[PDB]
Design a binder for this molecule. Structure first.
Ligand code: OVM
Length: 119
């Protein structure tokens, strides 16, 4: 029932994600010199360094907010991909499955802790 435990759990999950080779295209903002039309398709860029910095600044109130930004990294990849078979997109799908598998308990524990707090 620790309402704050999600933050360190998210830090550790981000550390695992940065160790995954599949995260390399998503560690820093998409390079506009490499993909000049990126902002014509993507309205809100997102990347794992921005997520980590937001968490470390104390600018996430809950793990749901962190989860919304990580999911935005994946939806941007899906919206920008020219093919569902592209390399970078395929890496996003695996990393998404790994992230979803690990964030589930973080979200569950936080929501349960919060319900206990408001019981
Ligand atoms: C820069 O982000 C992305 C996302 C998805 C696919 C690609 C690509 O070039 O195949 C690039």
């Amino acid at each position: 029932y620790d309402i704050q435990a999600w933050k360190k759990q998210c830090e550790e999950l981000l550390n695992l994600i940065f160790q995954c080779e599949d995260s390399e295209p998503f560690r820093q903002p998409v390079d506009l010199l490499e993909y000049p039309d990126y902002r014509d398709i993507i309205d809100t860029p997102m990347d794992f360094a921005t997520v980590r910095e937001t968490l470390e600044a104390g600018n996430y109130e809950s793990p749901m907010e962190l989860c919304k930004d990580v999911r935005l990294i994946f939806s941007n990849s899906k919206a920008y991909t020219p093919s569902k078979r592209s390399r970078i997109y395929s890496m996003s799908l695996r990393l998404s499955a790994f992230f979803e598998e690990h964030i589930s308990s973080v979200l569950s524990d936080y929501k349960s802790a919060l319900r206990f707090h408001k019981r």
